[PDB]
């Protein structure tokens, strides 16, 4: 079984540096051309850098967008390939996959990806505001989870007792550089006077945990 396993991702400010690492097993590592390929919503999948076998001088190749800033290297004794990044830009944000390219053809094995976030935003817990069920069958209510960084937050409802009908939306990046999302849930209107509805918000990077009771205003 071929396995590739990346590590070293994280959060970094623009101008900063970070080194990614990948460990391979299940094939003769020193024979093969190791690559980094990144993926973002805006640019899709982008080949980043390649380092070929020592038998061909272990030559390196870089996409134009990272040439001069990134350095790819390998340590055959450790079955490791590395990506050293410098002068990092917000648009370098993405998921970075370690991948084997089969001698100039397919990317035939891929790791699990490691996440790079380049941002000058400071780590911050969310504020949590109620989305109160409208005073006018089925009612909708929820929680607005605003102005946190970085991803992710987790939202549960009534400590996990309430799951069906929950929609926790994907976070959206605001022009402030902070994230925001809503978690909503539809419940029987008749249950508004019988059942309490509490959203539990957890933001690990800021050690923030908030419980917000949502009730008719």
């Amino acid at each position: 079984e071929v396995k590739l396993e990346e590590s070293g991702g994280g959060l970094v400010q623009p101008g900063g540096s970070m080194k990614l690492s990948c460990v391979a097993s299940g094939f003769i590592f020193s024979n093969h051309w190791m690559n980094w390929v990144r993926q973002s919503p805006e640019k899709g999948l982008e080949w980043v850098a390649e380092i070929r076998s020592k038998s061909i001088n272990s030559a390196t190749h870089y996409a134009e967008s990272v040439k001069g800033r990134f350095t790819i290297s390998r340590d055959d004794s450790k079955s490791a390939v590395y990506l050293q990044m410098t002068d990092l830009r917000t648009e370098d944000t993405g998921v970075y996959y370690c991948s084997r390219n089969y001698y100039g053809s397919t990317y035939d094995y891929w790791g699990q990806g490691t996440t790079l976030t380049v941002s000058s935003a400071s780590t911050k817990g969310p504020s949590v505001f109620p989305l109160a069920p409208s005073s006018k069958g089925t009612a909708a209510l929820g929680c607005l989870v605003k102005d946190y960084f970085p991803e992710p937050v987790t939202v549960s409802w009534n400590s996990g007792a309430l799951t069906s009908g929950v929609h926790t939306f994907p976070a959206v990046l605001q022009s402030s550089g902070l994230y925001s999302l809503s978690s909503v849930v539809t419940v029987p209107s008749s249950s508004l006077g019988t059942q309490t509805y509490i959203c539990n918000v957890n933001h690990k990077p800021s050690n923030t945990k908030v419980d917000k009771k949502v009730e008719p205003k």
Partner: protein
């Protein structure tokens, strides 16, 4: 670089349907087109090499064709494990490049959104900002027009939409549209309205409220 144009970006498949999607290279790439599948939260997985050669362990319903500039991946009867993104990649010349992807989603019958509007909470107003949320719940297909109107002025540039992944049980989407204003801008106006156009609605739906009332 060689550019790969994948079409469509979104393809809706009913299970048991024979589907195909397209990858066009901006210049000749011979047979050096390779196809990948990426399931939600997964890594790319190689499916077809050199346009038509299926990888071992890859189900036989997958087959590829094409040479020159126009390439096709076909799934002869889609299964629910094939719901994923699909990318092409050329290795004809350096640097190697990928298409933007085709997402396969589950086709189902049209379902109208249930629409809800939420005024900003008093808590948030005390903090100096106002978010107004318009919720479109459990609808299909994904395409919906949501317009904000504040005292009859159409809003532009001050709202953001977010859409869930397709629901695993009913194949619907939900969508939030959040209008964000300063506390002072919010208080200049009285009527806040969200108008929703969707194929499943016989007439567009408006939910609205008067600022500060109930």
């Amino acid at each position: 670089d060689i550019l790969l144009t994948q079409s469509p970006a979104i393809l809706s498949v009913s299970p048991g349907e024979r589907v195909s999607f397209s990858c066009r290279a901006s210049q000749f790439v011979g047979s050096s087109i390779h196809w990948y599948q990426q399931r939600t939260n997964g890594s790319p997985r190689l499916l077809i090499k050199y346009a038509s050669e299926s990888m071992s362990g890859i189900p036989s319903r997958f087959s590829g064709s094409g040479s020159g500039t126009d390439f096709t991946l076909s799934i002869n009867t889609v299964e629910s494990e094939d719901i994923a993104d699909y990318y092409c990649q050329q290795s004809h010349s350096w640097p190697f490049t990928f298409g933007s992807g085709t997402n396969l989603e589950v086709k189902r019958t049209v379902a109208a959104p249930s629409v809800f509007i939420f005024p900003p909470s008093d808590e948030q107003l005390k903090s100096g900002t106002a978010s107004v949320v318009c919720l479109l719940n459990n609808f299909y297909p994904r395409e919906a027009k949501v317009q904000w109107k504040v005292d009859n002025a159409l809003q532009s540039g001050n709202s953001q939409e977010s859409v869930t992944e397709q629901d695993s049980k009913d194949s619907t989407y939900s969508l939030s549209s959040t209008l964000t204003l300063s506390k002072a801008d919010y208080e200049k106006h009285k009527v806040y309205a969200c108008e929703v156009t969707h194929q499943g609605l016989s007439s567009p739906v408006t939910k609205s409220f008067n600022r500060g009332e109930c």
